Design a protein around this ligand. Structure first.
Ligand SMILES: COC(=O)N1CCCc2cc(NC(=O)[C@@H]3CC=CC[C@@H]3C(=O)O)ccc21
Ligand code: NA
Ligand code: NA
Ligand code: NA
Ligand code: NA
Lengths: 111, 115
């Protein structure tokens, strides 16, 4: 059931929000104009961020855990792609990806 | 937006994929589709809902299944994503996966910067 999924997945997501500073650039959608990065949507075809994932989860749009996971991977993949390995966002992203693997694994298990 | 005809797309992307494939030994567990019967991990398919591997990606590229670069990148990520999820951070194959990510990132960057 939707709330059953939401209850099982939401802590996963909260684990991502609560990483300071690492989640700071992932909490809103990337604004290429406002960030001065006009080539963003030339490289990143399908953007994803924490606010978007939360809104989908909150509103029943993942019928199955793996679809939720796909959107979290997409968010990491877009950031590793666009950003330099040396950059702040790229390393924040790496941190969040470890936090996410750690939390998502036993949730998939009991689910 | 560069528009890439099918042959251009192949010659822009194919060196990306050869780069992964010659990674020895890191690419070996990635050359063929994970066989959960062979390997005894038949809960692989309970965790990995859409499998992906080098042989599949080469077939999709060889048979015109990609029109733009981001679609081939999606599949490359999907192969890495599956392996990071299923494997433990401590395993040989998970560490293989990240080495392959590093290589793929270096190789595809010039492609992404040209579009
Ligand atoms: C992408 O890989 C995976 O996620 N799995 C899940 C668990 C570990 C795993 C092991 C193998 N076996 C091997 O690598 C074999 C021994 C060492 C060299 C290559 C051999 C081969 O089989 O060619 C294949 C696939 C996966
Ligand atoms: Na990582
Ligand atoms: Na990772
Ligand atoms: Na990586
Ligand atoms: Na990475």
């Amino acid at each position: 059931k939707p709330e059953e999924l939401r209850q099982a997945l939401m802590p996963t997501l909260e684990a991502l929000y609560r990483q300071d500073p690492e989640s700071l650039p992932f909490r809103q959608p990337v604004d290429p104009q406002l960030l001065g990065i006009p080539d963003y949507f030339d490289i990143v075809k399908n953007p994803m961020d924490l606010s978007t994932i939360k809104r989908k989860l909150d509103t029943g749009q993942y019928q199955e855990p793996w679809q939720y996971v796909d959107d979290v991977w997409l968010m990491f993949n877009n950031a590793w792609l666009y950003n330099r390995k040396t950059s702040r966002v790229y390393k924040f992203c790496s941190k969040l990806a470890e936090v996410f693997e750690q939390e998502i694994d036993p949730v998939m298990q009991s689910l």
